[PDB]
């Protein structure tokens, strides 16, 4: 039967820890897959780490230019959340270097970007078989959110983008049922950026807070009705969540530009409350270190800067790195509502540290009725390895 | 359907192994998670073992200060009984310091508690998806059982400590069913400390044999009834069961008060016979080494040191430690009580020993009819280990 | 229930990645079986990966003369698809050098055969049990498919073959019923040489493309119906499959008789499509590198040689090998028609590179309704080991 | 449901290869448990294989004594039939250096011997929880089958031996339902010898065939009737089946007393068939290499040494060991009649080869109707190891 997310995400004013996979410290010994791009998604009976292997294994030769995005010997593939990207627990789920994935109630829906850079290939997977395609557009580049896909009533919907990964790019929306595309459409963004989007469902509705790697330092955001008539532009917020980033005191919110000069970017999310947001990002404006959330009233309908709620999960001693959305399914969380929960990737090696490597683990936090304390749940691993 | 733990335990005249994973030994060259405090908890299909890892496997330079008891690495993970802690055949429960977790018929439900020492955040799952959560409440190292909990029909009970471990701290008994926590109670306890309770169902309430980090060589005890009235003492027997102690001719029982100067301890535990009691303690008086559990006539319920049964388990040549309660399900047992089975922790490492590493493995005993001979199944690994 | 394989086979236009394994890079760190002659095969619920293990892993002395194609230590063994050959996730199947399996709707069924050289067994396996046995009937090194067999409504079907690798040899077709063999048939080809069968389901009989390592170029055909009534010859296309071959400019088919002088060659695979044939191939025509697909209008009834599509997945610069075909069963892919996919094998290692082992691990790629775009699904292992 | 083992064992003409788990030979790299004793035992929808472990693996130095037979690190663990006793897939059975196991039809009971050898403890488990004990009789090594115990209509059998290893022995069997003691008799053999039987069902009774370690080279026989009373004697056959032992032709059988001087001995097996018997043995008299099984015409009721069947499965060039027997389930086989199946044990290492350690793999074979081919499915391993 179909899993409904047509539910309101719950209201939150704290978030707890769900997990910890210290995939790198095990690494230094256990056979971890090398990674890079984890994220989470739930199904009616558990929740999962999706991420991108990069056909190599942590502490060994095969792991040495791991910093280079594209490859065809990366692969999609799973564990239950918690575990490490261990090699003998995980199950495959497809060939690829960007991915999305999400359960819709009776089965696991995957898609998988590989091929050539100029026309690549996105499988689409349900049930653990290929079961649609669709092809660079665009031609270059074509990929995805890098977070878990949105579910509603037997409809999956999800973002791709084809195109500059600086100046202009193309945007569309997926739409599909039981592994078979039945919908789509461009969304028109003429001077705004977007890339992968992180997202959620909310009153039968899927949200999404994305990345401009163009030019603006506040989010792009899309709502998208199943029918797919959307609503594209930026988190309203007066405070910059993107990294590289300048001052919040110097930032000018909006609800429909891009703001600020800074280029570049990193995945972020974003929750809705009525007309507030909890927004997380790096805690370094410059650099990929720390993590922290922040609740600011009226955030999601107006320029407003007003901070309500902070919480650090990560501190500046630490680096960070990418952060995606999810819900957790009524049908665990006993609740009345979605109870949304996010996922903050920590990266170890290349560009940073001292090693031929690259990859991260993870730490994943959720809801929760009551505010919580600050700390920092790091990767903890000690750089450089044997090698 | 919910698991009815409303029967009496039965009455046991000896301990027969049930299992022994041998963690230490395989984990100089297996993949083994260096642990600490692990303990048992059935379901009505399988009884798992539960423990502390410290995000990092034996053999490896990770384990170094793996003696530190806190920090954001450790996890709490869960393997079928008997199996080692290694990786491949974990499944991730929460992220902690300090756990608890108990099936109560219907899914598992685990309790870790993580964050920083002077507001420690007490994640509540179940299902494998948090559900709720505990925020500390006297600001000092919010902690638990360390042992399986006890759910009756339906409702699942724990026991949490937070405060000083030497001085007077607080204690409370918190109440859930399906992962919300629906009841708490304050324990009055003034003079008394309550540790890491080893707590088990009999005759349709909680009955717990606790560890006072403060001034008593005996244990304190109570009594929790599904409506969260209680009663809180110590062993009435006549014969100290923590460590370190001091002989047990110069000991004076008391089921009301601490005795005995010693400040430190042990988690330990104890199963009620009727009036008698089954109580587990190490050898060695002074240190944990060894391990055997006495039978005292009336010892529940006088200042008895009436000695009926006697078995050894470790011998005083080999290392031991923690020690907790759990019963069996009746729907494994097949028998018409509540089986008693304990476990014993077998630490290696420092602060006794030439490492750099601190980790345990176990051994499980349960119930039986009959009296069993004694023996000692200890670790049994050469260390110090290539480091 | 018994899956119905009786449906025709979907008209592709292009391949799509399935999966990918990346075996032999694990293998430099991880604990992967070293292997030979993987293939695909799937039930109603999921796809493995069989193959031929050589009771030994990569980077250890065991992996040695691992060239030899035949030992009492080889043995057949699966893991879902996708996933390496890795010791931890495999499923043990049967002792053997040489294999075929498949699922008839309710269980798997597998063949194994071992023994010596001049009166090997094939021992017939369902549901995880040895059910019947297959003596050499030549007493030539009975061998069989290498790939995946069929079963339609209940029955399945396969191809052994007994004799010499080079002149005349003899071929049987066989037909079992959980597990139980029920029919055997004596194909006649006097002047022809068939050897490892690449086999799929269509239109209600049972379709092979087969490799003949005596005279030809070009590949051996087969059409069994249930009754074990069939037809056997060539494909038609002017253009020659196997390797080692010749131009295809100097090529002339036949649908009745081997074509060229090459006499060794390599396993391969086909699908008819109408009139038109898809036909896979290495890129190299004198070596065992690279990999390409091309359909042939009307190749399959006709010497034609009109190249409709071309896709490649495996560039000349890469090792390539085996390749075989299997189909996606309707309960998986929603479809009306069966799915053709093919899986190629990279080996690695002896002959060719400068290692004391040999193995392989594999791309998987399936039917899909559009063009693919060419590229290089590498094995991508950087020899040699450290041995 | 209880499984029907009523039915009479098939007429088999030969044995076919079940399956060879390589466990040595991937252990020289791989994370093995160092084991001894391994056993096949089947459920009506798996065969796993039983074995004891050293609380150790191959290729560490904790494998360093691993000959000594019992120490309190041994541990009965299991896999799927034809897995390595590997540790991430090994399930967790018993604690102990002897035992037995085997389903019911609606689970396993498994009877694990550990504790000190003046006073033994036998711990039965059903459905992964002790469920009763045996306490040593004799106070003199209590043990059991190392072979797979016999359930039939709900109700397991097992014989346990307590007493000296050479002289005089006390032998008893168990009868168990749902891991519960309901009977056991008391066997009188005065001058025979029993250790280690291998058993199966037949015609409603329990068939063994065991080891006579006192002064037998002839195996001693015993016939179990499920109220209990029994039938105890030696294989009539007039050729010895043990190891050590002396020529053929100068052995006179004797279904009543043991023959020969022949004082030490190795588990063994044996199958009747109508009057017949197929026996197993290892080729070397004096040693423990080799494998081979005869079929003796009338060779069950009669000192006949008529060979009507002899088929070689491990060469004089090889190590072998213990052997023992057990039944496919009829809801896995198909047929009418229980199909014997047998499995051979290949010892490595002390005290015949030049390692600090000793453990062993296994290849199992079972019935079928035709004869099959000579030849050796030998360990494999090349000792000594890094050590
Ligand atoms: C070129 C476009 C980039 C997205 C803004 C790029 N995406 C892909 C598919 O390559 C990402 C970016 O280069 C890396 C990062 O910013 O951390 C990850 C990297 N993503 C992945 N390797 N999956
Ligand atoms: C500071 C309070 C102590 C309890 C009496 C302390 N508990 C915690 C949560 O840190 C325990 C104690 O220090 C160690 C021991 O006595 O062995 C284990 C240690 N427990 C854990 N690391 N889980
Ligand atoms: C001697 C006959 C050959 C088939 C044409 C030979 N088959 C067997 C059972 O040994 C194959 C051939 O030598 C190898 C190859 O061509 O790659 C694989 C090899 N196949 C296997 N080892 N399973
Ligand atoms: C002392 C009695 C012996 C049986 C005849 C002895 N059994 C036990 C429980 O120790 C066996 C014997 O010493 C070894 C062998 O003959 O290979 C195995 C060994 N068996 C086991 N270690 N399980």
Redesign the interface.
Known sequence: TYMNNTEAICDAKGF???????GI??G????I?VIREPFVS?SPI??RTFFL?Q???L????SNGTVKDR???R?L?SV?????P??????????AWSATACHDGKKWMTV?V???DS???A?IH??????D?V??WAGDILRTQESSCTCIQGDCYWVMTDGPANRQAQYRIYKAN???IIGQTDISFNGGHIEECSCYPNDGKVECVCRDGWTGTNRPVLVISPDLSYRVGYLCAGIPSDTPRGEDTQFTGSCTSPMGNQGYGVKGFGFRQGTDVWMGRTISRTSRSGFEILRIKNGWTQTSKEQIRKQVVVDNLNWSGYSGSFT?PVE???KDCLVPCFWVEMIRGKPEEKTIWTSSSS?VM?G???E???????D???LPFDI
Chains 1, 2, 3, 4 share one sequence.
Not at 28 to 31: A, L, M, V
Not at 80 to 84: A, D, L, N, R, Y
Not at 86 to 95: G, I, L, P, T, W
């Open positions: 707890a820890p769900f997990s910890k996979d210290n410290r095990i230094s010994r256990g056979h897959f739930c558990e929740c292997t056909g190599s294994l502490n060994d030769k095969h490859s065809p010997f692969t593939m239950e959340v918690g575990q490490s261990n090699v003998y627990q995980a199950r495959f789920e497809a060939v998988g590989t091929g050539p026309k690549a290939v499988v349900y049930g653990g078989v290929p079961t395609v092809n660079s039981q592994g078979r957790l665990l969380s006993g730490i959720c929760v009725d009551y919580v304390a600050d700390w920092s749940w790091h903890g691993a000690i």
